[PDB]
Design a protein around this ligand. Structure first.
Ligand SMILES: *[C@@H]1O[C@H](CO)[C@@H](O[C@@H]2O[C@H](CO)[C@@H](O[C@@H]3O[C@H](CO)[C@@H](O)[C@H](O)[C@@H]3O)[C@H](O)[C@H]2NC(C)=O)[C@H](O)[C@H]1NC(C)=O
Ligand SMILES: *[C@@H]1O[C@H](CO)[C@@H](O[C@@H]2O[C@H](CO)[C@@H](O)[C@H](O)[C@H]2NC(C)=O)[C@H](O)[C@H]1NC(C)=O
Ligand SMILES: *[C@@H]1O[C@H](CO)[C@@H](O[C@@H]2O[C@H](CO)[C@@H](O)[C@H](O)[C@H]2NC(C)=O)[C@H](O)[C@H]1NC(C)=O
Lengths: 53, 108, 173, 173, 173
């Protein structure tokens, strides 16, 4: 369905939030889009190894 | 007696990150770099709205097929929207020459 | 880990310290408590922040339409396009994942750094006026009221003010 | 090297130690011998293994026919294909070689880490019951039969059991 | 920094020392002066040199004409070419900048390493014959004329030759 929302990256299934560098939604896009990658998880640690007890 | 110790923060976070040497390393803080959600909507790009063809292909829309919304109102667009198998194209059969090019150039 | 402080001689973390990443636990009669060292914690937040904002904000992306549609006598072109798309996807996938791995390791090593450097900072202030008990902990020979603790925290400690009492209590040990 | 243990104060390696990467050499009357510390060695094997399997297993490659053949009025296309192929080859060559370099440095630094951290592990158990002789070696003040050595190896050492004898032997030194 | 020597316990640098990156300042009666440790400085110059020459010399580039010109019924081709060019430019921009960042951090950490390792080299030679005054500085208990200083510099120091005088001067301290 077409909608009045605004975005900078569009893909068949639905628009994308283009702030992060990488995506895995759909390869064929239109816009100022993140790069498509065959990745399930790209998570970066900002804290430290959590060792409670 | 008196004591001074030095240590480091910890919390209940279960965020795991992969590392060169070790995998599933639970960490206190993390940040995602990988967008993996779409809003299931054809939003408009950089302020300009797409061109809706509804039931027609580009051929039908531009040839003036009798069943297509000609959308005289539309004076600009960012991209064009068809369906997988549009219903109303070249209503009188025949070959549309250099069709991919024209689709490309009318895209925006 | 790489410096032997986090998961090293300091076996674990302090769930009670919410003031920041790096900090102190004291035990003067007056009572206990946790504190954070805002200098090192703040420098670490600025550094890591700059790292993440450097992996994100560095991605320039022009306005681009990835899709190209070809007919049945343009298979060479279609496979060329496919070859471009797939090539870039391979590159970015590989480099992205290895980047995340390597820099995660680097981050953990950087925290381990900050903690070890902090331990050494405290040690270089207490040479003979304390002993290395257990791990990430020093026991004083002279009693160190809140004032003295908060002195170790802000760097200023004043060693010769407490050197004598220490010289006494240490001999019999 | 980067931590001053391998090629640093520990001048060389032990060709006689086959049990693993990291280990011990003891000299109690009963006799000498080499052993390996399987904890640190095993953690290093797991880490390095995961690294290599991370540089290899991360290479997704679709089914691809690199070759394209063109006629004599398709030189623009032929040079475009050539441009794609050559571009990817440049990328992968450069990134691959620098990756190998940087990660080799990182690996050597990681071993240097493990050894230094191990040395410190032993040092923190023997504070006054031994002195730092030569390099990567401690001399005891109390005699330490096999049982005691094997105690230092598995972490448990029991310091106050040997503190008195040490306190004697150390004074005249 | 990452090892707590540069910008760490050693607050700053020596503008008067031009002989190299790493060096010494002595204060024996005969007089003062600055010197450089050419072993570590030279190893650092070789390493960094090799790094830079590895980021530059590793860039193979075939002979290539980036430009392609198309007519008005070749917009698909023109946008494909545009897509190739823009893709490579994105890749090289991102990877280039992050490479410069990461390896700059690595270089600074490498210098911090060399200085800390040098400090420790001196410390392990002077165990009880000197104390850790201030920062990046040792005060002797026995007086050490130029010859002795130049001995610490080239590694050979001869400890038991000065152990007695030190044993005297240290007791009252
Ligand atoms: C726009 O698209 C619609 C939907 O395809 C077109 O209407 C459809 O036209 C087909 C003929 O190609 C009709 O199918 C035929 O129906 C007869 C009975 O009427 C049947 O005996 C034939 O075997 C065949 O199945 C279909 O019923 C018809 N659907 C509707 C809802 O009218 C329409 O013609 C297109 N408009 C233009 C301008 O091309
Ligand atoms: C688009 O993505 C950005 C980044 O992924 C989102 O910003 C995040 O917002 C949450 C909650 O506000 C924070 O916890 C994160 O730290 C933010 N990330 C960054 C990098 O700043 C943003 O909210 C997203 N926008 C939408 C509409 O979903
Ligand atoms: C596009 O064409 C389809 C025909 O397939 C239209 O669907 C019909 O809609 C009417 C009422 O909206 C229904 O009574 C019919 O049963 C539908 N036909 C089928 C085959 O399901 C659809 O309405 C058209 N959309 C637009 C915007 O014109």
């Amino acid at each position: 369905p077409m909608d009045e929302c605004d975005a900078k990256c569009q893909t068949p299934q639905g628009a994308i939030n283009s702030s992060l560098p990488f995506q895995n939604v759909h390869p064929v896009t239109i816009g100022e889009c993140p790069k498509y990658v065959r990745s399930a998880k790209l998570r970066m640690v900002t804290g430290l190894r959590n060792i409670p007890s | 007696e008196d004591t001074i110790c030095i240590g480091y923060h910890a919390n209940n976070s279960t965020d795991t990150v992969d590392t060169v040497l070790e995998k599933n390393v639970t960490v206190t803080h993390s940040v995602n770099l990988l967008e993996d959600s779409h809003n299931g909507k054809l939003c408009l790009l950089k302020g300009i709205a797409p061109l809706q063809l509804g039931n027609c292909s580009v051929a039908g829309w531009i040839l003036g097929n009798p069943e297509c919304e000609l959308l005289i109102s539309r004076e600009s667009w960012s991209y064009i929207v068809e369906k997988p198998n549009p219903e109303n194209g070249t209503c009188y059969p025949g070959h549309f020459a250099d069709y991919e090019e024209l689709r490309e150039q009318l895209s925006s | 880990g790489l410096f032997g402080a986090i998961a090293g001689f300091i076996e674990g973390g302090w769930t009670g310290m919410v003031d920041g990443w790096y900090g102190y636990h004291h035990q003067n009669e007056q009572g206990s408590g946790y504190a954070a060292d805002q200098k090192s914690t703040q420098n670490a937040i600025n550094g890591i922040t700059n790292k993440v904002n450097s992996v994100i904000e560095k991605m320039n992306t022009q306005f681009t339409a990835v899709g190209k549609e070809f007919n049945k006598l343009e298979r060479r072109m279609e496979n060329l396009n496919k070859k471009v798309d797939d090539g870039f996807i391979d590159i970015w996938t590989y480099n992205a994942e290895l980047l995340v791995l390597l820099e995660n390791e680097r981050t953990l090593d950087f925290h381990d750094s900050n903690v070890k450097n902090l331990y050494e900072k405290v040690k270089s202030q207490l040479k003979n006026n304390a002993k290395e008990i257990g791990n990430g902990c020093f026991e004083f020979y002279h009693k160190c009221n809140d004032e003295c603790m908060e002195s170790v925290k802000n760097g200023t400690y004043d060693y010769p003010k407490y050197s004598e009492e220490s010289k006494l209590n240490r001999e019999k040990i």
